[PDB]
Amino acid sequence: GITLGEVFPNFEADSTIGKLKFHDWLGNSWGVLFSHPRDFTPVSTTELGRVIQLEGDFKKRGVKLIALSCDNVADHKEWSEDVKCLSGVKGDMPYPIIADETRELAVKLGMVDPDERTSTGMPLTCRAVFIIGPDKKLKLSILYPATTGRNFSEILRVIDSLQLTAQKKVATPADWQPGDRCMVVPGVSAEEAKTLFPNMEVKAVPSGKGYLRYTPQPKS
Amino acid sequence: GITLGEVFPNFEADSTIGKLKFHDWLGNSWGVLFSHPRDFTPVSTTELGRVIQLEGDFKKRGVKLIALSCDNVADHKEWSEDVKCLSGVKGDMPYPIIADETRELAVKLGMVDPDERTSTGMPLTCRAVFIIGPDKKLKLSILYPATTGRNFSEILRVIDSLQLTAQKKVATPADWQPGDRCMVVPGVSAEEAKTLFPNMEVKAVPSGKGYLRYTPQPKS
Known part of the structure; x- marks a missing residue:
C-alpha cells in the first residue's frame, strides 16, 4: 500500500491511449487516479459515466483524470462505448483507462478487493481514489469496495x-x-x-x- | 497499512474509558474508528462536535464510534469539553477517544499525516476513517490530511x-x-x-x- 505524502509510483502501464509513464503523463499538474473492479459491470459504468459528465468540472480546476482496472485494453475500448452512452455526453472518452493486467498496481497501491475475483480466482481492484499533487505526492485517498459506488x-x-x-x-x-x-x-x-x-x-x-x-x- | 477485507487488529490501547481490547469493546457490532491530528485544534473540534450531533444517526444503524489521536488521555478529557460546547449538545461524551502515544497504531494503520508533526518532529495521525464489520474485517477506509475536514x-x-x-x-x-x-x-x-x-x-x-x-x- 501507499501512505499520504509518498511519491506516487512512476509506473509504466498500457492503456486506452497506449503505453504511458505516469509522472510524464501527469506532468506539473493535479491528478486523480481511480480504480474499478471490472469492465462491463453496472456500478462501475454509472461511475465512469458520471466522470464523463463532470469532465468540465475537473478541467476548470486543472485536474487530470485517469481510470484503471485489471481488464485488457480491448475490453476497455469496447466498454467505453457503453460508458459514453450512459453518460449522455457525445464524443470520445475524455480520460484514459489503465490496463493493470499483471496486478502490480493492484498489489502495490493496496487496492485489491476482498470479495471480487475473476472466474479463475485472479485478484481485482476495489473502488480506490488517489489524489496526487503537482509534486507527485499522494495528498488524499479513499478505498471503497466493489459493492459501494463513490x-x-x-x-x-x-x-x-x-x-x-x-x-x-x-x-x-x-x-x-x-x-x-x-x-x-x-x-x-x-x-x-x-x-x-x-x-x-x-x-x-x-x-x-x-x-x-x-x-x-x-x-x- | 491495512487493506480491505483484512481482520482489523485486536489492539490494546488506553482511552477516556480506560484500557480497551479492540475486538472486546467492539463486540458483535459495526464500528467506525476515526483519527484526528491533535487535540485543541480547530478543524478537529468541528468534526468531533459534528460526530456528537450525529451520534443518534450512528446509533440507529448500530455503529459503535471511536476516536483517536496521539495525545494523552488527560488532554482528551479537557478538550472533550470544547468539542461538547461547539456541538450544542449537552451531556456526556458519547464515544471514546484512544491515546496512541507510542504511535504504534498510527504506523500499523497507515495513517501518519504527511505534513503535521509535533514541535520536535514526532508523527501525528491524519484524518483517517475505518469502517469495520461485525466480523472484525475492514469494509471501507478513507485517508484525509490535516488540511481537509471530513x-x-x-x-x-x-x-x-x-x-x-x-x-x-x-x-x-x-x-x-x-x-x-x-x-x-x-x-x-x-x-x-x-x-x-x-x-x-x-x-x-x-x-x-x-x-x-x-x-x-x-x-x-
Whole structure:
C-alpha cells in the first residue's frame, strides 16, 4: 500500500491511449487516479459515466483524470462505448483507462478487493481514489469496495480544500463547502494572523485556548 | 497499512474509558474508528462536535464510534469539553477517544499525516476513517490530511450502502442516496435476478450485454 505524502509510483502501464509513464503523463499538474473492479459491470459504468459528465468540472480546476482496472485494453475500448452512452455526453472518452493486467498496481497501491475475483480466482481492484499533487505526492485517498459506488461531489469538494490549503494558511472544517469560512491553522501566531487574516474571529471555548479561529475563505 | 477485507487488529490501547481490547469493546457490532491530528485544534473540534450531533444517526444503524489521536488521555478529557460546547449538545461524551502515544497504531494503520508533526518532529495521525464489520474485517477506509475536514454524511451514506449490500445482491451506483435504486450485482444469473427483483429494468447498451440492471431499492 501507499501512505499520504509518498511519491506516487512512476509506473509504466498500457492503456486506452497506449503505453504511458505516469509522472510524464501527469506532468506539473493535479491528478486523480481511480480504480474499478471490472469492465462491463453496472456500478462501475454509472461511475465512469458520471466522470464523463463532470469532465468540465475537473478541467476548470486543472485536474487530470485517469481510470484503471485489471481488464485488457480491448475490453476497455469496447466498454467505453457503453460508458459514453450512459453518460449522455457525445464524443470520445475524455480520460484514459489503465490496463493493470499483471496486478502490480493492484498489489502495490493496496487496492485489491476482498470479495471480487475473476472466474479463475485472479485478484481485482476495489473502488480506490488517489489524489496526487503537482509534486507527485499522494495528498488524499479513499478505498471503497466493489459493492459501494463513490460520491464524485465529495471528490470535487476535497479537491477544492486541498487546492486552497496548499496555497493559504488555512484548513477546511467538517462539512465545508467552497465559500464557507475556513479555520486558521494552529501554527499561525496571533501576531502573524493580524496581517494574514484581519477578519478572523477567535471563538471562545471552555479550555481558554485561542485555537478556534475562523476566517472568510481567502481569494486564492 | 491495512487493506480491505483484512481482520482489523485486536489492539490494546488506553482511552477516556480506560484500557480497551479492540475486538472486546467492539463486540458483535459495526464500528467506525476515526483519527484526528491533535487535540485543541480547530478543524478537529468541528468534526468531533459534528460526530456528537450525529451520534443518534450512528446509533440507529448500530455503529459503535471511536476516536483517536496521539495525545494523552488527560488532554482528551479537557478538550472533550470544547468539542461538547461547539456541538450544542449537552451531556456526556458519547464515544471514546484512544491515546496512541507510542504511535504504534498510527504506523500499523497507515495513517501518519504527511505534513503535521509535533514541535520536535514526532508523527501525528491524519484524518483517517475505518469502517469495520461485525466480523472484525475492514469494509471501507478513507485517508484525509490535516488540511481537509471530513464529510460525516458521506460516512453515513456509505454505511447505509454497506449495510444494504450485505442483505441483498445489489450494489449502490455513483452518488446513490438511500431510497434510490441500486444495481443488481453482475454475478446474479438472469433467472435469479428475475426471481429476486420483479421491478428490474435491464438498460440496453451498445455492447449488447445485459449487466446494466437496476432495482428500485430492494426490500431492506
